[PDB]
PDB file of C-alpha atoms and ligand atoms in Angstrom:
ATOM      1  CA  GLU A   1      -0.041   0.143   0.565  1.00  0.00           C
ATOM      2  CA  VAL A   2       1.256   3.771  -0.928  1.00  0.00           C
ATOM      3  CA  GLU A   3       0.567   5.577   2.159  1.00  0.00           C
ATOM      4  CA  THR A   4      -0.356  10.028   1.472  1.00  0.00           C
ATOM      5  CA  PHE A   5       1.006  11.996   4.036  1.00  0.00           C
ATOM      6  CA  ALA A   6       0.429  16.030   4.066  1.00  0.00           C
ATOM      7  CA  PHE A   7       2.893  17.850   4.429  1.00  0.00           C
ATOM      8  CA  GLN A   8       2.951  20.817   7.770  1.00  0.00           C
ATOM      9  CA  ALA A   9       1.756  23.838   6.461  1.00  0.00           C
ATOM     10  CA  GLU A  10       5.673  25.694   7.042  1.00  0.00           C
ATOM     11  CA  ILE A  11       6.695  22.580   5.040  1.00  0.00           C
ATOM     12  CA  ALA A  12       3.721  23.177   2.240  1.00  0.00           C
ATOM     13  CA  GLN A  13       4.733  27.619   2.608  1.00  0.00           C
ATOM     14  CA  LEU A  14       7.785  26.712   2.270  1.00  0.00           C
ATOM     15  CA  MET A  15       8.038  24.659  -0.819  1.00  0.00           C
ATOM     16  CA  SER A  16       5.139  26.726  -3.167  1.00  0.00           C
ATOM     17  CA  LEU A  17       7.967  29.871  -1.704  1.00  0.00           C
ATOM     18  CA  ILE A  18      11.017  27.676  -3.046  1.00  0.00           C
ATOM     19  CA  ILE A  19       9.022  26.897  -6.390  1.00  0.00           C
ATOM     20  CA  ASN A  20       7.375  30.503  -6.876  1.00  0.00           C
ATOM     21  CA  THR A  21      10.189  33.138  -6.126  1.00  0.00           C
ATOM     22  CA  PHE A  22      12.340  34.190  -9.104  1.00  0.00           C
ATOM     23  CA  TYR A  23      15.920  33.784  -8.145  1.00  0.00           C
ATOM     24  CA  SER A  24      18.429  32.389 -10.671  1.00  0.00           C
ATOM     25  CA  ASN A  25      20.734  30.524  -8.417  1.00  0.00           C
ATOM     26  CA  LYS A  26      19.349  27.494  -8.874  1.00  0.00           C
ATOM     27  CA  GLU A  27      22.705  25.497  -8.386  1.00  0.00           C
ATOM     28  CA  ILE A  28      23.762  25.323  -5.118  1.00  0.00           C
ATOM     29  CA  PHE A  29      20.906  22.577  -4.697  1.00  0.00           C
ATOM     30  CA  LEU A  30      23.534  19.942  -5.119  1.00  0.00           C
ATOM     31  CA  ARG A  31      25.873  21.482  -2.517  1.00  0.00           C
ATOM     32  CA  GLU A  32      22.810  21.571  -0.013  1.00  0.00           C
ATOM     33  CA  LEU A  33      22.545  17.258  -1.397  1.00  0.00           C
ATOM     34  CA  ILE A  34      26.120  16.388  -1.651  1.00  0.00           C
ATOM     35  CA  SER A  35      26.572  18.102   1.892  1.00  0.00           C
ATOM     36  CA  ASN A  36      23.031  16.057   3.125  1.00  0.00           C
ATOM     37  CA  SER A  37      25.066  12.794   2.019  1.00  0.00           C
ATOM     38  CA  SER A  38      28.013  13.322   3.533  1.00  0.00           C
ATOM     39  CA  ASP A  39      26.869  14.113   6.691  1.00  0.00           C
ATOM     40  CA  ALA A  40      24.581  11.166   6.526  1.00  0.00           C
ATOM     41  CA  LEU A  41      28.432   9.402   6.009  1.00  0.00           C
ATOM     42  CA  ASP A  42      30.205  11.120   9.157  1.00  0.00           C
ATOM     43  CA  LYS A  43      27.097   9.353  10.679  1.00  0.00           C
ATOM     44  CA  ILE A  44      27.307   5.626   9.594  1.00  0.00           C
ATOM     45  CA  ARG A  45      31.277   6.445  10.548  1.00  0.00           C
ATOM     46  CA  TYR A  46      31.018   7.823  13.417  1.00  0.00           C
ATOM     47  CA  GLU A  47      28.639   4.794  14.509  1.00  0.00           C
ATOM     48  CA  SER A  48      30.965   2.133  12.929  1.00  0.00           C
ATOM     49  CA  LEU A  49      33.597   3.190  15.775  1.00  0.00           C
ATOM     50  CA  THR A  50      31.686   1.663  19.247  1.00  0.00           C
ATOM     51  CA  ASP A  51      29.411  -0.761  16.770  1.00  0.00           C
ATOM     52  CA  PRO A  52      31.104  -2.659  14.110  1.00  0.00           C
ATOM     53  CA  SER A  53      28.854  -4.974  12.594  1.00  0.00           C
ATOM     54  CA  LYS A  54      26.435  -1.057  11.124  1.00  0.00           C
ATOM     55  CA  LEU A  55      28.881  -1.418   8.328  1.00  0.00           C
ATOM     56  CA  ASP A  56      27.739  -4.736   7.257  1.00  0.00           C
ATOM     57  CA  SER A  57      25.266  -3.320   5.429  1.00  0.00           C
ATOM     58  CA  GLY A  58      28.704  -1.751   3.263  1.00  0.00           C
ATOM     59  CA  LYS A  59      31.639  -0.884   4.173  1.00  0.00           C
ATOM     60  CA  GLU A  60      32.376   1.092   0.610  1.00  0.00           C
ATOM     61  CA  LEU A  61      31.554   5.588   2.125  1.00  0.00           C
ATOM     62  CA  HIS A  62      31.043   7.049  -1.070  1.00  0.00           C
ATOM     63  CA  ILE A  63      28.818   9.536  -3.262  1.00  0.00           C
ATOM     64  CA  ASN A  64      27.954   8.649  -7.223  1.00  0.00           C
ATOM     65  CA  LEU A  65      26.500  11.770  -9.118  1.00  0.00           C
ATOM     66  CA  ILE A  66      23.991   9.675 -12.145  1.00  0.00           C
ATOM     67  CA  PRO A  67      22.483  11.677 -14.560  1.00  0.00           C
ATOM     68  CA  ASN A  68      20.242  10.132 -17.340  1.00  0.00           C
ATOM     69  CA  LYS A  69      19.562  12.212 -19.427  1.00  0.00           C
ATOM     70  CA  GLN A  70      16.823   9.783 -20.985  1.00  0.00           C
ATOM     71  CA  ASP A  71      14.627   9.831 -17.327  1.00  0.00           C
ATOM     72  CA  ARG A  72      15.571  13.412 -17.188  1.00  0.00           C
ATOM     73  CA  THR A  73      17.076  12.655 -13.585  1.00  0.00           C
ATOM     74  CA  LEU A  74      19.874  13.837 -11.170  1.00  0.00           C
ATOM     75  CA  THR A  75      20.246  11.091  -8.957  1.00  0.00           C
ATOM     76  CA  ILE A  76      22.405  12.058  -5.500  1.00  0.00           C
ATOM     77  CA  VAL A  77      23.700   8.135  -4.051  1.00  0.00           C
ATOM     78  CA  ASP A  78      25.615   7.964  -0.555  1.00  0.00           C
ATOM     79  CA  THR A  79      26.562   5.030   1.791  1.00  0.00           C
ATOM     80  CA  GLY A  80      25.787   7.014   4.178  1.00  0.00           C
ATOM     81  CA  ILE A  81      23.568   5.957   7.505  1.00  0.00           C
ATOM     82  CA  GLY A  82      20.223   5.746   5.803  1.00  0.00           C
ATOM     83  CA  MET A  83      16.663   6.827   7.098  1.00  0.00           C
ATOM     84  CA  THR A  84      14.030   4.700   9.246  1.00  0.00           C
ATOM     85  CA  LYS A  85      10.091   5.122   7.824  1.00  0.00           C
ATOM     86  CA  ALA A  86       9.883   7.574  11.352  1.00  0.00           C
ATOM     87  CA  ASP A  87      12.058   9.664   9.894  1.00  0.00           C
ATOM     88  CA  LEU A  88      10.427   9.590   6.290  1.00  0.00           C
ATOM     89  CA  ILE A  89       6.383  10.396   8.059  1.00  0.00           C
ATOM     90  CA  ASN A  90       7.039  12.204  11.073  1.00  0.00           C
ATOM     91  CA  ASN A  91      10.505  12.661  12.541  1.00  0.00           C
ATOM     92  CA  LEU A  92      12.918  14.957   9.612  1.00  0.00           C
ATOM     93  CA  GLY A  93       9.636  17.323   8.999  1.00  0.00           C
ATOM     94  CA  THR A  94       9.523  18.593  13.048  1.00  0.00           C
ATOM     95  CA  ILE A  95      12.680  19.146  13.383  1.00  0.00           C
ATOM     96  CA  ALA A  96      12.202  20.933  10.191  1.00  0.00           C
ATOM     97  CA  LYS A  97       8.958  22.789  11.679  1.00  0.00           C
ATOM     98  CA  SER A  98      11.775  25.258  13.600  1.00  0.00           C
ATOM     99  CA  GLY A  99      13.945  26.071  10.550  1.00  0.00           C
ATOM    100  CA  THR A 100      11.419  26.762   7.872  1.00  0.00           C
ATOM    101  CA  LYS A 101      10.208  29.177  10.113  1.00  0.00           C
ATOM    102  CA  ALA A 102      13.681  31.168  10.545  1.00  0.00           C
ATOM    103  CA  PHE A 103      14.720  30.589   7.208  1.00  0.00           C
ATOM    104  CA  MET A 104      11.368  32.327   5.796  1.00  0.00           C
ATOM    105  CA  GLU A 105      12.053  34.842   8.738  1.00  0.00           C
ATOM    106  CA  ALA A 106      15.674  35.186   7.817  1.00  0.00           C
ATOM    107  CA  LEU A 107      14.720  36.108   3.892  1.00  0.00           C
ATOM    108  CA  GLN A 108      12.568  39.110   5.204  1.00  0.00           C
ATOM    109  CA  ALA A 109      16.068  40.452   6.397  1.00  0.00           C
ATOM    110  CA  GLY A 110      16.946  40.440   2.600  1.00  0.00           C
ATOM    111  CA  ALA A 111      18.531  36.457   3.254  1.00  0.00           C
ATOM    112  CA  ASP A 112      19.250  34.586   0.252  1.00  0.00           C
ATOM    113  CA  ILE A 113      17.775  31.164  -1.199  1.00  0.00           C
ATOM    114  CA  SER A 114      21.551  30.154  -1.217  1.00  0.00           C
ATOM    115  CA  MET A 115      21.112  30.517   2.695  1.00  0.00           C
ATOM    116  CA  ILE A 116      18.971  27.342   3.358  1.00  0.00           C
ATOM    117  CA  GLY A 117      21.201  25.302   4.361  1.00  0.00           C
ATOM    118  CA  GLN A 118      22.070  27.116   7.199  1.00  0.00           C
ATOM    119  CA  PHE A 119      18.954  26.841   9.339  1.00  0.00           C
ATOM    120  CA  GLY A 120      18.899  22.379   8.176  1.00  0.00           C
ATOM    121  CA  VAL A 121      16.864  22.445   5.539  1.00  0.00           C
ATOM    122  CA  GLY A 122      18.266  22.943   1.789  1.00  0.00           C
ATOM    123  CA  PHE A 123      16.576  19.235   0.876  1.00  0.00           C
ATOM    124  CA  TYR A 124      13.820  21.364  -0.070  1.00  0.00           C
ATOM    125  CA  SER A 125      16.409  23.583  -2.720  1.00  0.00           C
ATOM    126  CA  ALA A 126      15.718  20.039  -4.879  1.00  0.00           C
ATOM    127  CA  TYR A 127      11.991  21.759  -5.683  1.00  0.00           C
ATOM    128  CA  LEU A 128      14.636  24.542  -7.402  1.00  0.00           C
ATOM    129  CA  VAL A 129      15.341  23.202 -10.312  1.00  0.00           C
ATOM    130  CA  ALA A 130      13.138  19.412  -9.801  1.00  0.00           C
ATOM    131  CA  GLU A 131       9.168  18.749 -11.049  1.00  0.00           C
ATOM    132  CA  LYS A 132       9.355  15.781  -8.271  1.00  0.00           C
ATOM    133  CA  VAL A 133      12.078  14.531  -5.908  1.00  0.00           C
ATOM    134  CA  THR A 134      11.876  10.955  -5.402  1.00  0.00           C
ATOM    135  CA  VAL A 135      13.785   9.792  -2.802  1.00  0.00           C
ATOM    136  CA  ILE A 136      14.496   5.723  -2.174  1.00  0.00           C
ATOM    137  CA  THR A 137      16.454   4.651   1.401  1.00  0.00           C
ATOM    138  CA  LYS A 138      17.642   1.933   4.029  1.00  0.00           C
ATOM    139  CA  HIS A 139      18.372   2.979   7.018  1.00  0.00           C
ATOM    140  CA  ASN A 140      19.966   0.124   9.104  1.00  0.00           C
ATOM    141  CA  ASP A 141      17.383  -0.514  12.028  1.00  0.00           C
ATOM    142  CA  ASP A 142      14.724  -1.019   8.864  1.00  0.00           C
ATOM    143  CA  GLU A 143      13.007  -1.942   5.455  1.00  0.00           C
ATOM    144  CA  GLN A 144      13.683  -0.087   2.719  1.00  0.00           C
ATOM    145  CA  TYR A 145      11.575   2.881   1.666  1.00  0.00           C
ATOM    146  CA  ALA A 146      10.054   5.174  -1.491  1.00  0.00           C
ATOM    147  CA  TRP A 147       9.349   8.379  -0.369  1.00  0.00           C
ATOM    148  CA  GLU A 148       7.889  10.596  -3.361  1.00  0.00           C
ATOM    149  CA  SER A 149       6.523  14.689  -3.715  1.00  0.00           C
ATOM    150  CA  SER A 150       5.364  16.643  -6.284  1.00  0.00           C
ATOM    151  CA  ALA A 151       4.660  19.752  -4.231  1.00  0.00           C
ATOM    152  CA  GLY A 152       1.069  20.826  -4.189  1.00  0.00           C
ATOM    153  CA  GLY A 153       0.983  20.037  -0.143  1.00  0.00           C
ATOM    154  CA  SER A 154       1.415  16.063  -0.739  1.00  0.00           C
ATOM    155  CA  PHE A 155       3.974  12.665  -0.577  1.00  0.00           C
ATOM    156  CA  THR A 156       4.232   9.548  -0.073  1.00  0.00           C
ATOM    157  CA  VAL A 157       5.246   6.797   1.755  1.00  0.00           C
ATOM    158  CA  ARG A 158       6.007   3.140   0.246  1.00  0.00           C
ATOM    159  CA  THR A 159       8.131  -0.022   1.557  1.00  0.00           C
ATOM    160  CA  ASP A 160      10.640  -0.338  -1.918  1.00  0.00           C
ATOM    161  CA  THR A 161       9.945  -3.238  -3.795  1.00  0.00           C
ATOM    162  CA  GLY A 162      12.866  -2.299  -6.418  1.00  0.00           C
ATOM    163  CA  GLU A 163      16.532  -3.102  -6.305  1.00  0.00           C
ATOM    164  CA  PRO A 164      17.944  -3.412  -2.358  1.00  0.00           C
ATOM    165  CA  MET A 165      20.752  -1.152  -1.486  1.00  0.00           C
ATOM    166  CA  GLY A 166      22.084  -2.486   1.304  1.00  0.00           C
ATOM    167  CA  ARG A 167      22.219   0.586   2.714  1.00  0.00           C
ATOM    168  CA  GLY A 168      21.666   4.680   2.236  1.00  0.00           C
ATOM    169  CA  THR A 169      20.323   7.182   0.159  1.00  0.00           C
ATOM    170  CA  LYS A 170      19.367   7.457  -3.606  1.00  0.00           C
ATOM    171  CA  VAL A 171      17.531  11.371  -4.564  1.00  0.00           C
ATOM    172  CA  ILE A 172      16.382  11.099  -7.652  1.00  0.00           C
ATOM    173  CA  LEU A 173      15.380  15.247  -9.032  1.00  0.00           C
ATOM    174  CA  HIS A 174      13.143  14.606 -11.812  1.00  0.00           C
ATOM    175  CA  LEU A 175      14.420  17.983 -13.325  1.00  0.00           C
ATOM    176  CA  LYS A 176      11.896  20.645 -14.674  1.00  0.00           C
ATOM    177  CA  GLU A 177      12.281  20.886 -18.533  1.00  0.00           C
ATOM    178  CA  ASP A 178      14.152  23.783 -18.622  1.00  0.00           C
ATOM    179  CA  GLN A 179      16.386  22.609 -15.702  1.00  0.00           C
ATOM    180  CA  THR A 180      18.088  20.100 -18.517  1.00  0.00           C
ATOM    181  CA  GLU A 181      21.995  21.854 -17.920  1.00  0.00           C
ATOM    182  CA  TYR A 182      22.071  19.414 -14.897  1.00  0.00           C
ATOM    183  CA  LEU A 183      22.413  16.724 -16.831  1.00  0.00           C
ATOM    184  CA  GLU A 184      25.425  17.950 -18.148  1.00  0.00           C
ATOM    185  CA  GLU A 185      28.871  16.454 -17.486  1.00  0.00           C
ATOM    186  CA  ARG A 186      30.761  19.812 -17.490  1.00  0.00           C
ATOM    187  CA  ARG A 187      27.626  21.453 -15.345  1.00  0.00           C
ATOM    188  CA  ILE A 188      27.712  18.708 -12.655  1.00  0.00           C
ATOM    189  CA  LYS A 189      32.011  18.848 -12.565  1.00  0.00           C
ATOM    190  CA  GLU A 190      31.481  22.839 -12.469  1.00  0.00           C
ATOM    191  CA  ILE A 191      29.820  23.029  -9.851  1.00  0.00           C
ATOM    192  CA  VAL A 192      31.397  20.042  -7.947  1.00  0.00           C
ATOM    193  CA  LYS A 193      34.265  21.710  -8.380  1.00  0.00           C
ATOM    194  CA  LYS A 194      33.147  25.076  -7.289  1.00  0.00           C
ATOM    195  CA  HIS A 195      30.821  24.331  -4.208  1.00  0.00           C
ATOM    196  CA  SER A 196      31.936  20.521  -2.533  1.00  0.00           C
ATOM    197  CA  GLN A 197      35.312  20.740  -3.307  1.00  0.00           C
ATOM    198  CA  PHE A 198      36.588  19.661  -0.249  1.00  0.00           C
ATOM    199  CA  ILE A 199      33.551  17.168   1.164  1.00  0.00           C
ATOM    200  CA  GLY A 200      35.875  13.814   2.397  1.00  0.00           C
ATOM    201  CA  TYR A 201      34.185  11.358   0.519  1.00  0.00           C
ATOM    202  CA  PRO A 202      34.963   9.929  -2.721  1.00  0.00           C
ATOM    203  CA  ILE A 203      32.264  11.822  -5.681  1.00  0.00           C
ATOM    204  CA  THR A 204      31.906   9.783  -9.137  1.00  0.00           C
ATOM    205  CA  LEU A 205      30.637  11.953 -12.226  1.00  0.00           C
ATOM    206  CA  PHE A 206      28.834   8.920 -14.155  1.00  0.00           C
ATOM    207  CA  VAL A 207      29.478  10.252 -17.720  1.00  0.00           C
ATOM    208  CA  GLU A 208      26.728   8.824 -20.353  1.00  0.00           C
ATOM    209  CA  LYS A 209      25.591   5.662 -21.508  1.00  0.00           C
TER     210      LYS A 209
HETATM  211  C1  PU9 B   1      17.074  17.117   6.997  1.00  0.00           C
HETATM  212  C2  PU9 B   1      17.852  16.952   6.661  1.00  0.00           C
HETATM  213  C3  PU9 B   1      19.524  15.963   6.797  1.00  0.00           C
HETATM  214  C4  PU9 B   1      18.452  14.676   7.516  1.00  0.00           C
HETATM  215  C5  PU9 B   1      17.850  13.827   6.570  1.00  0.00           C
HETATM  216  N1  PU9 B   1      19.034  13.787   5.178  1.00  0.00           N
HETATM  217  C6  PU9 B   1      18.977  14.361   3.924  1.00  0.00           C
HETATM  218  C7  PU9 B   1      18.032  15.706   3.978  1.00  0.00           C
HETATM  219  C8  PU9 B   1      16.272  15.473   3.685  1.00  0.00           C
HETATM  220  C9  PU9 B   1      15.476  15.991   4.618  1.00  0.00           C
HETATM  221  C10 PU9 B   1      13.702  15.810   5.044  1.00  0.00           C
HETATM  222  O1  PU9 B   1      13.230  16.995   5.541  1.00  0.00           O
HETATM  223  C11 PU9 B   1      13.353  17.776   6.485  1.00  0.00           C
HETATM  224  C12 PU9 B   1      13.041  15.175   3.935  1.00  0.00           C
HETATM  225  O2  PU9 B   1      11.552  14.474   4.455  1.00  0.00           O
HETATM  226  C13 PU9 B   1      11.214  15.710   3.783  1.00  0.00           C
HETATM  227  C14 PU9 B   1      13.949  14.051   3.115  1.00  0.00           C
HETATM  228  O3  PU9 B   1      12.834  13.051   3.164  1.00  0.00           O
HETATM  229  C15 PU9 B   1      12.430  12.836   2.540  1.00  0.00           C
HETATM  230  C16 PU9 B   1      15.856  14.314   3.392  1.00  0.00           C
HETATM  231 CL1  PU9 B   1      16.308  13.338   1.637  1.00  0.00          CL
HETATM  232  N2  PU9 B   1      19.487  13.384   3.437  1.00  0.00           N
HETATM  233  C17 PU9 B   1      19.768  12.963   3.783  1.00  0.00           C
HETATM  234  C18 PU9 B   1      20.972  11.655   3.805  1.00  0.00           C
HETATM  235  N3  PU9 B   1      20.947  11.303   1.928  1.00  0.00           N
HETATM  236  N4  PU9 B   1      20.571  10.878   4.190  1.00  0.00           N
HETATM  237  C19 PU9 B   1      20.333  10.849   5.636  1.00  0.00           C
HETATM  238  N5  PU9 B   1      19.264  11.450   5.924  1.00  0.00           N
HETATM  239  C20 PU9 B   1      19.149  12.189   5.106  1.00  0.00           C
END
């Protein structure tokens, strides 16, 4: 069964602001997502110093960027800690409620969208370039899940029966039609070099086809 949930009003409100505001510097979505991956990798690494069996689901700690022009997707893959079902439906949204308010406040004081990450809600910058975001994730403690949202005030969560991923997260960006520059290898390298050059995990940029 696919379950459908409503975003908290404040999140819905943040998402519409990100979709509707005129803001050309969309490219920062990628450093926000890579940074989320790096944090998630830090987390599993740390946890495994006191419980080595936490890496039975995979020793390798890395990030893959995978463009597919045929599907028009850019996928950010990591072997980090993953997210549980409670993370997906409740935990992360509760936390996010306070960062959203603060971010929205800051924007009315002349902050700009690029600073979203300082408020712990940078995930939602995905909606600068994606019409739909699909997140497949597996945490050691839980089953594999798929989250998706096209905004519009709702998201879904289902158990994922696709290919098992071991441990980690895939964020699949279904790009807006005018945002296909982020499928281009030279454009991606440029952004990773500009914004994400000092990440402490290998970042492999996959090419097509
Ligand atoms: C906020 C924040 C960071 C924690 C959640 N998270 C994120 C960002 C994130 C935040 C969310 O809510 C605030 C969220 O749900 C709406 C979310 O999921 C669909 C993601 Cl991927 N990316 C990763 C990742 N690659 N690996 C592990 N946890 C992640």
